[PDB]
Amino acid sequence: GDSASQAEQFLKLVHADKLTVPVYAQVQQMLAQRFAQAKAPESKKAVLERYQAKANAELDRAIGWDKIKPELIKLYTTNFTESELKDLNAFYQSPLGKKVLEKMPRLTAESAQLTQAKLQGAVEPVNKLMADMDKELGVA
Template structure:
């Protein structure tokens, strides 16, 4: 009985994997629709703003005398490996893998609508404020977090 169940599960997993692989074929038109969403959403500016926000948050934990050098090194690293130019094709592919071509076209229409434009305008501030809220939550419970970590790593 266990062997039969195992075989059924293996076949099901193989079938599901094959179905997933078959449904993730990305046509040039599908990829173009994903690129259009990123353009309409002003993803390049959002990406840059997000990176700046993350760097600003991360640099707060660096001693002041090392902060300038830290930011300089991180900026050089990000330009080389994590810039929009190095990531945009991968991002378009990611969107194409997760949305149908029609959904992508609908998203592009949304991002060009008044509400979509407003979202794009407000998004950097919302991301910054969200990061600050997260940081405040951690700081407000830092002692508890430290204790939880100590307890978790006791042998």
Template structure:
């Protein structure tokens, strides 16, 4: 039984790997350039900050500082830009052609692209606030739906 399960997992992994599009070195280099041009590292760090701010809002105030400290340590160790940037470049390279990646990098270096990059953290934070507000406004409905869904 364990052997069959192991073989099924192995075959699944091989099939999943086979479905990953081939990436050329030129695509990967172009994807890395998109990450630089779009200031992805800065955007990533800003996103983590917004996420931690949102998550810490539900933590009691007397534990909030320690929560943020622990989360920052965790993120630095396991979810830092250094740990994911190569994977991000590969992901972009799998989704876009080399020409598309070059066009994206050119866009991010344009005045409109630069403005988009500048405004993105504010847009992310305001979008998160909109989502949070929508959930809060309908929290009673959500609680009712959860109660109904988990009735035994």
């Protein structure tokens, strides 16, 4: 019924269209890295300009929002009811919903930096640990 419209509104509110940005950036940085890698005359950077446009168009063919959007709507309409999607929209339309969306990438990154920093403390003991098992079983 009116589920697809609510699913579409959800993907907009959640900025699911920007999920591909890392792929477009990686291919753009790869070309400039390939341009530098050999020769690199800054007088011919307009040649890199068209090859970066070509790569952008080729990604748009495979992973453009118009290709992704239909299959994500099927994903949400099959997993949620029209009423559930409407309520998800009400939450993400709300000031708190918008606050969660902006904070989440940074909160996730800060949360992961914290754990990775702490985990480095277990590197030396786990290295010693495996070395002791290899010693005990008679290895090297």
